Amino acid sequence: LHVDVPKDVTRPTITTSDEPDTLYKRLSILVKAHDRAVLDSYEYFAVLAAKELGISIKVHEPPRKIERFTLLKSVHIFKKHRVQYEMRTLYRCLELKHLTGSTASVYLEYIQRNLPEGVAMEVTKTQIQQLPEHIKEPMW
Amino acid sequence: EEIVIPKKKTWDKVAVLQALASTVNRDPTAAPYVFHDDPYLIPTSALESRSFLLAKKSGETAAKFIINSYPKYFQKDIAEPHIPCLMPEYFEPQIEDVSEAALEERIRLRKVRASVDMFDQLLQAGTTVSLETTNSLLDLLCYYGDQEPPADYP
Amino acid sequence: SPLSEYALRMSRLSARIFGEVARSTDSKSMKVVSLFSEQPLAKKKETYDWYPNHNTYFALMGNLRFLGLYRDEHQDFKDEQRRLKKLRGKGKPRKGEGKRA
Amino acid sequence: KNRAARVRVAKGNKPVSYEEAHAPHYIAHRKGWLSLHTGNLDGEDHAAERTLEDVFLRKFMMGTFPGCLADQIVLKRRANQVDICALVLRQLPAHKFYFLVGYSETLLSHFYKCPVRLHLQTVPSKVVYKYI
Amino acid sequence: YYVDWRMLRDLKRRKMAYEYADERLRINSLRKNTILPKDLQEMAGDEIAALPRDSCPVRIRNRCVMTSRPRGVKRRWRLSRIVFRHLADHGLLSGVQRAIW
Amino acid sequence: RKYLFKGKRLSIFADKAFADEPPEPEASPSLWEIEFAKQLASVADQPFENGFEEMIQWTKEGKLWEFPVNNEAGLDDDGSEFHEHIFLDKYLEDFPKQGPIRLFMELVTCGLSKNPYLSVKQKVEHIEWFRNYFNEKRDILKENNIAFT
Amino acid sequence: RPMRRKALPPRTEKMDTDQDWPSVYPTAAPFKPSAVPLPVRMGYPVKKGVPMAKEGNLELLKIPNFLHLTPVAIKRHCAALKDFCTEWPAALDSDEKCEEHFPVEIDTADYVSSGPSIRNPKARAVTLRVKLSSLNLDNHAKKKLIKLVGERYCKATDVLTITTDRCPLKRQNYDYAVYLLTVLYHESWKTEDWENSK
């Protein structure tokens, strides 16, 4: 818009509670897809997004998996003639570190909502908490 | 020594989408989002604007008619969590017995003539009717002025 | 090697804590724990919902074809072959009036 | 000889599209996949249910837009959303498409209990990759 | 309409096995152990026999959901080899390609 | 001159030292109040302006999943607790305190505690079935020297 | 006599080179040749031919485009999303520092897939990992704790791993693993008469 611009855009209400926040030591995001290039674009989008919010991120590529199975080519007889098919799964692991629970929800929502079609995520949060109050003191 | 843990912020389920929406502005070279994004399907005039948004509503009403008339085909629910707004609607009373409870159903469904028939039948038998229930009948009749609620069908 | 009293009594204390079978149970009697810890084959969604509701698809698409909102090229193909076959006098006989009496 | 998904040679007068020209062994090499869901990825469930839903969605769109489809539809599932992207010939009037979009979306959202949106790109006529 | 009468019979077998899954579990549990008297186990051996034959879950056969083919089916898609090839060779299955190596 | 908020007022009413004394839902929403609210919504009812506003509306209606994804959204098993699923021996009080029936039911309740596909109500129903089964078979058990209930 | 409708010229022609592209593609959408002002071509070219054009291109439609996610948009998006984030405590600047004050590690997994159902059976499982050094255990207690847990204890790392998936929900499985730790800890300190016969 050249001359017509919003004046005071409405922004969502974020209210700070009195409950303490979760502390995630680690948060592993294993995305899976049949296409490597899609993971590269998502890897770029996710790493850029993490860096813009202050999150610490590392990336590695777990080894790909290929599943192959054989079928019978003819509708009837002709056993020796087969057709083989395969499915390829490719992985990109985004290992985040030292995240509070508010930072991990907003980031995961933002990147989960923008997950391309054909891509599956496997988040593995690792929370750190104190010891149970009973365990802290031995009681007979 | 004791670490100070930050107080967790909380927000509504739509808060994140609302934040992303605030960033984007109107596209000056595009028609309203309701209209289909295609040169062949973009409304040239103001008539085609209204006519395109009346054929779209017409198809929506044609689909809801099929769903609400053959509900047995649209009853399998495979959505977890369950989506109430994507289930067939039922507006005809399913309580057959003539009781104050049955009258309350008709009042809830907003049928005006059927509720009057069952209310009169309740009076014919003489069964007690709660003043609150009798008021829910008057509310429906007074608001709709004794006429069945407006609706469109074949 | 054999399990001494300390070894056996610790195993029972562990099983008691971890909610495992605490007594000495034969392999045969351990199937009762498996039967009641695993969903039966007939209760798994793959088994009872193996098929799509073919009645819903065939009925729904037939209803839509009669409302003019769906076109079945296959059915129109069959509808005209019956029309032509009936003209030729090869149409379906009425029930109870077949060639054999 | 292999007969699967091959548009065989005529005498140079058959107009095949890009999708039709390429045989199965070019899948993932020269031409992509018409449907994109997460159900065939490793350690993922509901492949049977996604595949059946696609078969129906393809037959439904053909009948709902009879003779108006220039090429096979492209199905995109993201979260619970389904997206149908079809190249459609400019045969029908514009308002008729608005009706068929409203109808086909509402009907398919109440049948599979998911949000379904229809994206239509109109072409003047079928695009011919090569004459075979 | 289902594909054929064989698919219909199987569908009913799948719906009656779901109804009798709990029953056949509880009764069969009384027999798969060595802790209960053999007199009770012999009697549960007869209650399980008395249930309808279609309640038995070993009479279910996995058939192609679209052609009702008894053998050659792939359990992940519930389609026969012939039907699966038609969809795969056309790019209609998401991520399935030919295996060249 | 024509000051909007400077000048004489009607003065029929007085300053509301007491405000909203009667509650808004004095009675359950009537048809009149339910219908006026629907009309107020139409006053501000404008069409979607982008994919964000459409997804926002779908979320408010439950059509679209909430994010971040929670695979147990709306899946609360009767507000139970871990101890209810795991400790099921309270229900075996009716059964013999010792003997073969106790040994068998211990195996039954051990499996039920390890069953994540059943609710507490469904687990109890398995226990009740055996209670009634052995009661019917009181005579066969007595021959074997087992006394039930 | 019949009138065939004429398509308008593509709106890319009206798009300036200094436009606000984020506004053009706010969210994930399919490739629209009339909205993307780029001469993109895709397709294996025929002999003495060029790759096919964007208009009527099924291959470009089959691609999951990132036009909605551009470096300019992402930076404008994350700028709004900063108010949501909370600050990690500065004191916990190292992994060892975290173990000092927060010895208990709870692993929970989420899964994102495409379909009508959001349900995954694997989401209920929970895994608790604590180091025995963090626990206050006497020489007797540590030996008893290590025998009861069996293979859950790893001598090399001195970490006890309790994995609980028996309960249906994740909040139950999590509460159960915390319970298992309390009983194992308290039981280890308790001394039974039969223990003197070791």
Ligand SMILES: [Mg+2]
């Ligand atoms: Mg068999």
